Amino acid sequence: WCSFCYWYGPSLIVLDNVEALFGKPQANDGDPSNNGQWDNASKLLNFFINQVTKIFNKDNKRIRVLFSGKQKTQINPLLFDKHFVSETWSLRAPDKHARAKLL
Amino acid sequence: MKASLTFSLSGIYAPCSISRDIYLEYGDKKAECLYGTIRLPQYGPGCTPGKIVHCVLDDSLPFCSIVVPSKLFGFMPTQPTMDFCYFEPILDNVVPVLDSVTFLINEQLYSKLMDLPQEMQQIQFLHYKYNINSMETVVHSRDILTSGLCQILNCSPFPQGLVDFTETQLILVNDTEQKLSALKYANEDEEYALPKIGTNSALSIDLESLPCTISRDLLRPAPHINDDNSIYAFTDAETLLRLDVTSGSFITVSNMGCVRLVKLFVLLLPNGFKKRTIYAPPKIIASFPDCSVVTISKSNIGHTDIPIANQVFISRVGGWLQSQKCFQNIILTTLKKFFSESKRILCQNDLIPIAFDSSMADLNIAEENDESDDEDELGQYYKNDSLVWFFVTSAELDCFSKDNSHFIIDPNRTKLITTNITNRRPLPLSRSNLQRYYGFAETFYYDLHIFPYVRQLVNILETSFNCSQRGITLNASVLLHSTTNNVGKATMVRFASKYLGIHLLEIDCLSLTSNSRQLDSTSKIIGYIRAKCENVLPYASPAVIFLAHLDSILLDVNANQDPEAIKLQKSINFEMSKLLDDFTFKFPGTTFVGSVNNIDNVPSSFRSHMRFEILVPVPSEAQRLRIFQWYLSSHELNRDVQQKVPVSYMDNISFSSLSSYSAGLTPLDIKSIVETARMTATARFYQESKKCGWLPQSILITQEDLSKATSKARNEFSVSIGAPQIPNVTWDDIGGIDFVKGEILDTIDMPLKHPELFTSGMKKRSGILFYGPPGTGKTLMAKAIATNFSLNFFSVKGPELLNMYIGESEANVRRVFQKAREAKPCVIFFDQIDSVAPKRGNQGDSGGVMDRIVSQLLAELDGMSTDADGVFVIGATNRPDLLDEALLRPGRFDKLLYLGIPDTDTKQLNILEALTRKFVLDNDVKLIELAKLCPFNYTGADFYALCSDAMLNAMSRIARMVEKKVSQHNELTGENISTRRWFDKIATKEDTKVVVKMEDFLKAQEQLTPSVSRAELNHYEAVRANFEGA
Ligand SMILES: Nc1ncnc2c1ncn2[C@@H]1O[C@H](COP(=O)(O)OP(=O)(O)OP(=O)(O)O)[C@@H](O)[C@H]1O
Ligand SMILES: Nc1ncnc2c1ncn2[C@@H]1O[C@H](COP(=O)(O)OP(=O)(O)OP(=O)(O)O)[C@@H](O)[C@H]1O
Ligand SMILES: [Mg+2]
Ligand SMILES: [Mg+2]
């Protein structure tokens, strides 16, 4: 993916359910020792963030990414700790007027 | 657009002038004078902010040309000039007038103006002296007025604009400052300070390297042949006029070693370079390593000699950034491109720089051979980001030749022959950078006084090789770790390596690790490290091997895991320790750097094979001041924004106000701050870009966006327990309001070292244990002092963060005090100590199933308190009967401090009124004193509950008024309907303007609002504060 991205110029990526790729298991109990901070999925996430961050610092026009998930906190610790994510939004249960337009 | 650039000796404030074609085509008759903007061919990636210009017709000037007053830039006729510019006319003619300008003048003329009795005399004499004309004169901050004598300091609001003597406020300054003598235009110097000499043998003089490459269109003498900067070298006309050549056609260089061939060019006036050197590309400084600094030669060697090599061997210099397998295709491709693109001159025993784009894996583009050019267009959609050296042997030239040291290669004839290794020392960054020349993502840089531990690591590595190998060998191993987990510790190696010329290998075994399943993948990791290193370690002269994130590999041993997996851990530990020494057997002078994010998790079974370890802390104020300077320096802030409009801060920034107030504990990644600002500043620029009132033609950062950014950064990290420094207003440490306020300052003023640079090792700290006003106040009190005489409020949140898990929770105490101390200067608030409720073993927690908090807090923070530095306690106890008094005693944490509640005589009633303010009281009389009709002993926080009740009464009044308006809404609408639309579509101000005039605070108070406390419990506190609270 990253190889294609650098090729197509200004480009965008999304991942429809990031929980499958990079969700930390919610139990916090994959191992009792500190290495619970680096299970296999979080290891993937760090690799991805490293690649992206390195290319991003070369030219910020080229790649952005969108993550879609269930609860903004429940994705992953490292995703916030490295300040990879920033500007953010959420959908809310639509108001009566839009509800009518939908219906 | 580009226009032909020329200069005159005219005064700086005189108009420029333009060729008739420009004047006729762009002289819009709507303006008396054509305004424009200029930029010059500055070297390197950056650009100067475009300077406004004022110009007139001149039919004499050649087509599409400009004359500018030399002293505007500070140029002189003593050196060859530039020849073209970037220019634009200011279409739509609109230009801003400055709100103010500041001028700084020598004492004589300053006093001659200051003693004038009237303003217009000063104005008119300045107009005479400097030819400044109101409305029309273009100015910038730091513009010269006269070298040695006067200058223009700053401008408002923009750093450039027009001056109106009637509305641009004029500020005149003098201080006899020697900086006036540093005003020297761009040149003012008599070159005959080097007196003329009739001949010289070699004119040996210092050789240096540029901060950047040189764009080909700058190459003023413009040789017609397509040929490479790699052969070019650049210097002033000075020294060149001490040779008998200019734009020298033939130069050869040697410095107690081999010879190089080079071509010379002249550098022009706008530079800020050294007054005396030759500047070269790093391709030169690959020879003469770290020495050989001074000698050159020039002679008619030949125009087109040495035209071939019949055979050569060319070599990988080798290195982790080179020798890994997957990059090979692109490096070999661009290597052959370097020879295919043109003829070029080479020397024997010589080094060529080659760079490429990483992540070009899988993508091969030039599948069709020859055809029309394409490589250069990709080569401008590319921009390189990793750099490697290739080394060429001597040419096997046919027949005898006197020339036996240099040769030409070209796309025809002899092919490249690769060979295995040719070991060579990497250049020391202080001899010449490389990253800067190629503009790569840059290794951060240090000054060795302000950061101690970089100097420590330097002193290790610098000695262990170069200074050691004169004697018996010594390997080295170091472990780097930190309490905080984002401290940049890996970047330390990236620095020190290039600083000491240490050849680096670095290992991403955090995740690039095959199956890597700790509980299953048996031994593959060890093979992965061993077989990788073995292919590249041999014939690297120095060597540092660096492993990231050792916690990925090593782990503790516990009852919780299968002994089989534990024996896997054992195997990995042992083989790692052996390979660690095996490098010290197979590969002399190898050195090892480890990194760990939590020191405890590596067992002592490995830790014993350290030679050193370093705790890297989070930075402090002096470091942060250096680090912001880095991120806000021009070239690093710009290089990644491809947008043509440059970006800068402006020097009204307070690096000191950032350094602490803006920065607190913040865990590096200040990058996040500076980028957040750069976004917001760019947004307002594109906001005004919508044909708004003016376009300052540069993105300009501002302190307000830094303040907003930092405050956002404290809350976007919404999980963070911390708090900002300034939750306090109107309550700025009024030390005169009572004696106790007159003594809180003792505990802060002293360790601020204002009485002395205290020993940090004698007198126990006067930490405060605050009874204070017992009923209410404390919630505010600590915050109030903390903002106004201290610098943060990161606080223990005392009820939370006790972990239940078996034997764990001492970790949270040790962490919280670590994170506290990690900000140097400021207190921790502590709630009631009933948040801990230490209670001597009975009728409660009973000290058995829990002791873990108090059993640590009795000790370690009291150790800090007895050294009495940096961090201080301000607890807010009310119920000492619930506490053991093992703290709260003269032996540890004394100063049981009480204030009580004021009986009735209060200025706090006036301060009550003063904080009902910000909302209007319509009365002329203050009417406050009637509140003292309250029975005495009452003066609690309910003062502001009563202000709340008065405000709600005003709300009820305006609510029934709008209800009346609704009831009569038939007076202006067909029905008393649509209230939720009506209020918005009428909106005749009346926007809840406050009605404290109804004095309804008494109307509340007379109810005896029973949220006040007045019982015998207050008397209980008041007596026991003396009887036991002392
Ligand atoms: N004080 C600093 N000086 C220079 N660069 C810094 C600093 N703090 C952070 N950085 C930058 O942030 C990144 C830090 O990466 P590095 O691998 O060194 O540490 P980290 O990722 O925070 O920690 P860890 O190694 O524990 O994963 C680099 O891009 C580095 O340039
Ligand atoms: N001396 C005072 N002067 C003015 N306002 C005061 C004073 N004491 C209390 N207040 C009011 O109450 C606030 C501070 O006291 P507050 O009632 O919040 O404390 P608390 O909640 O009883 O404290 P603690 O943290 O000990 O539980 C102030 O913001 C102000 O509104
Ligand atoms: Mg790191
Ligand atoms: Mg309180």
Curated annotation (Swiss-Prot), chain A:
It is found in: Cytoplasm, Cytosol; Peroxisome membrane. Coiled coil: none annotated. It comes from the Eukaryota. Induction: By oleate. Signal peptide: none annotated. Disulfide bonds: none annotated. AAA-cassette D1 is required for interaction with PEX6. ATP-binding in AAA-cassette D2 is required for interaction with PEX6. ATP-binding and hydrolysis in AAA-cassette D2 is required for proper function in PEX5 dislocation. Component of the PEX1-PEX6 AAA ATPase complex, a protein dislocase complex that mediates the ATP-dependent extraction of the PEX5 receptor from peroxisomal membranes, an essential step for PEX5 recycling. Specifically recognizes PEX5 monoubiquitinated at 'Cys-6', and pulls it out of the peroxisome lumen through the PEX2-PEX10-PEX12 retrotranslocation channel. Extraction by the PEX1-PEX6 AAA ATPase complex is accompanied by unfolding of the TPR repeats and release of bound cargo from PEX5. Present with 2100 molecules/cell in log phase SD medium. Interacts with PEX6; forming the PEX1-PEX6 AAA ATPase complex, which is composed of a heterohexamer formed by a trimer of PEX1-PEX6 dimers. The PEX1-PEX6 heterooligomers associate with the peroxisomal importomer via interaction of PEX6 with the peroxisomal membrane anchor PEX15. Belongs to the AAA ATPase family. This is Peroxisomal ATPase PEX1. It comes from Saccharomyces cerevisiae (strain ATCC 204508 / S288c). The chain holds residues 510 to 612 of 1043 of the full protein.
Swiss-Prot record, chain B:
ATP binds at G772, P773, P774, G775, T776, G777, K778, T779. Residues 767-956 are annotated as: AAA-cassette D2. One of its GO terms (cellular component) is cytosol. Changing K778A: In PEX6pA2; increased amount of peroxisome-bound PEX6. Results in accumulation of PEX5 on peroxisomal membranes. In Amut mutant; abolished ATPase activity of the PEX1-PEX6 AAA ATPase complex. Pfam families: AAA, AAA_lid_3, N1_PEX6, PEX6_4th. It is found in: Cytoplasm, Cytosol; Peroxisome membrane. It comes from the Eukaryota. Signal peptide: none annotated. It catalyses: ATP + H2O = ADP + phosphate + H(+). Changing Y805A: Cells are unable to grow on a medium with oleate as a sole carbon source. Keywords: ATP-binding, Cytoplasm, Hydrolase, Membrane, Nucleotide-binding, Peroxisome, Peroxisome biogenesis. It is a peripheral membrane protein. GO terms for molecular function: ATP binding; ATP hydrolysis activity; protein transporter activity. InterPro entries: AAA+_ATPase, AAA_ATPase_domain, AAA_lid_3, ATPase_AAA_core, ATPase_AAA_CS, P-loop_NTPase, PEX6_4th_dom, RecA-like_PEX6_r2. One of its GO terms (biological process) is protein unfolding. SUPFAM superfamilies: P-loop containing nucleoside triphosphate hydrolases. Present with 1630 molecules/cell in log phase SD medium. AAA-cassette D1 is required for interaction with PEX1. ATP-binding in AAA-cassette D1 is required for attachment to PEX15. ATP-binding and hydrolysis in AAA-cassette D2 is required for release from PEX15 and proper function in PEX5 dislocation. Component of the PEX1-PEX6 AAA ATPase complex, a protein dislocase complex that mediates the ATP-dependent extraction of the PEX5 receptor from peroxisomal membranes, an essential step for PEX5 recycling. Specifically recognizes PEX5 monoubiquitinated at 'Cys-6', and pulls it out of the peroxisome lumen through the PEX2-PEX10-PEX12 retrotranslocation channel. Extraction by the PEX1-PEX6 AAA ATPase complex is accompanied by unfolding of the TPR repeats and release of bound cargo from PEX5. Belongs to the AAA ATPase family. Interacts with PEX1; forming the PEX1-PEX6 AAA ATPase complex, which is composed of a heterohexamer formed by a trimer of PEX1-PEX6 dimers. Interacts with PEX15; anchors PEX1-PEX6 heterooligomers to the peroxisomal membrane and mediates their association with the peroxisomal importomer. Interacts with UBP15. This is Peroxisomal ATPase PEX6. The lineage of its organism: Eukaryota, Fungi, Dikarya, Ascomycota, Saccharomycotina.
